[PDB]
Swiss-Prot record:
Enzyme nomenclature, EC number: 3.2.1.14
Effect after changing residue 172 to D/Q: Loss of activity
GO terms of molecular function: carbohydrate binding; chitin binding; endochitinase activity
Keywords: Carbohydrate metabolism, Chitin degradation, Glycosidase, Hydrolase, Polysaccharide degradation, Repeat, Signal
Stated consequence of mutating residue 168 to E: No change in activity
GO BP term, example: polysaccharide catabolic process
UniProt similarity note: Belongs to the glycosyl hydrolase 18 family. Chitinase class II subfamily.
Protein name per UniProt: Chitinase A1
Positions of the catalytic residues: 172 (proton donor)
Catalyzed reaction equations: Random endo-hydrolysis of N-acetyl-beta-D-glucosaminide (1->4)-beta-linkages in chitin and chitodextrins
Source species of the chain: Niallia circulans (Bacillus circulans)
Any one annotated GO CC term: extracellular region
Length: 419
């Protein structure tokens, strides 16, 4: 091949999440990933040790379980409070896969991520810490110098041991929001910035020693409250980029149906009383970061490779913005949510579900008139509007949750084609 012409686009990021638990019943393994579709993979998740255990027993979350803090062999370790630990040692580093032999330090999903690099040397891997279920100790870590130091040094340790290229903090969320059982403080706003600065300090030193650049990112909330509760301009100066979670704006937890990731404001949503319709859309979320002073190149737009549904929605408006009986009792792996590949096989203009298009919000939805279910989702067309927005605003690229939900690579192919 002739050496290809360089274009500004050559530089968009495509950051795909891989959830560690996909390797269980979902039967979607790291080795199933096509690395050519992404620039970075965020591995979800590592956790934080506190008093020798980790996890979150909050019963309002989907996985109310704790475990001892362990090493890569699933043996209990004694580490200081605030240490980043493997979230699920067995699947992360213990299970063997094709190519593994007895004579290697680690196996599991993480070694398979490193194999994807060997085969696809342009790929970078990033460990994501936290998320919805494991955000309960961030406030405690960020609250004092000593635990910020422990956490930052442990991020270097983890990256070095497991050959990650970077670390990503998914604190959901500083100050307010997230699961009720999360530790929270007003000072989370300033403390988060200092946590990030300390991590950058340690990554800068480690990179100088190790002969490389280590990356630091966060996943941010898209609401105005998140922006008010964080120092986005200061964060942006420290991190390599921010992955904004421009999705989960509406879902099975509310009675009025609406969109998971509407791109633009639809006046009809406000007329319907959809909570926060004015601001709960992708463009408003991204614009809030730009308005705060986040450079566009440091803003990577989150895109969902799943939808959300409701049961018992009236026929009016084809189910859209209607007061339904509740969240959908059906879902691909958990009630209320639908992976895109499942939608492709079983729902989009199939089995009584008819597709409709909201041309203001620029997203599709399904309504089954016989059974009254409504599903908001994203498809190739709506992803195309989201990439058009990325390009128009000069954003850094796209992030998506998550690889196992896009099994046919339909949405990945769209991102690739557009970015």
């Amino acid at each position: 091949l002739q050496p290809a012409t360089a274009e500004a686009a050559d530089s968009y990021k495509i950051v795909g999440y891989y959830p560690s638990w996909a390797a269980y019943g979902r039967n979607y393994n790291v080795a199933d990933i096509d690395p050519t579709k992404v620039t970075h993979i965020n591995y979800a998740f590592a956790d934080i040790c506190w008093n020798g255990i980790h996890g979150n027993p909050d019963p309002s979350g989907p996985n109310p379980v704790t475990w001892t803090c362990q090493n890569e062999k699933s043996q209990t370790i004694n580490v200081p409070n605030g240490t980043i630990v493997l979230g699920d040692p067995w699947i992360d580093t213990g299970k063997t896969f094709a190519g593994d032999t007895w004579d290697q330090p680690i196996a599991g999903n993480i070694n398979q991520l490193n194999k994807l690099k060997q085969t696809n040397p342009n790929l970078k891997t990033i460990i994501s810490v936290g998320g919805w279920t494991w955000s309960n100790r961030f406030s405690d870590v960020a609250a004092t110098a000593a635990t910020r130091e422990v956490f930052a040094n442990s991020a270097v340790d983890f990256l070095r041991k497991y050959n990650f290229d970077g670390v990503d903090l998914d604190w959901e969320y500083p100050v307010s929001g997230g699961l009720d059982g999360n530790s929270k403080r007003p000072e989370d706003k300033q403390n988060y910035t200092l946590l990030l600065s300390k991590i950058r300090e340690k990554l800068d030193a480690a990179g100088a020693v190790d002969g490389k650049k280590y990356l630091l990112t966060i996943a941010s909330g898209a609401s105005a409250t998140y922006a008010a509760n964080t120092e986005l301009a200061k964060i942006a100066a420290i991190v390599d980029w921010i992955n904004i979670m421009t999705y989960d704006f509406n879902g099975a937890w509310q009675k009025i149906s609406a969109h998971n990731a509407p791109l633009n404001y639809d006046p009809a949503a406000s007329a319907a009383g959809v909570p926060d319709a004015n601001t709960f859309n992708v463009a408003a979320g991204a614009q809030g970061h730009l308005d705060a002073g986040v450079p566009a190149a440091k803003l990577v737009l989150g895109v969902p490779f799943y939808g959300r549904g409701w049961d018992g929605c009236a026929q009016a408006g084809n189910g859209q913005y209607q007061t339904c009986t509740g969240g959908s009792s059906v879902g691909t792996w958990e009630a209320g949510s639908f992976d895109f590949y499942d939608l492709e096989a079983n729902y989009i203009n199939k089995n009584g579900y008819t597709r409709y298009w909201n041309d203001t919000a620029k997203v599709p939805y399904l309504y089954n008139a016989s059974n009254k279910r409504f599903i908001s989702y994203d498809d190739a067309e709506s992803v195309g509007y989201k990439t058009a927005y990325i390009k128009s605003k000069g954003l850094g690229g796209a992030m998506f949750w998550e690889l196992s939900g896009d099994r046919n690579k339909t949405l990945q192919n769209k991102l690739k084609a557009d970015l």
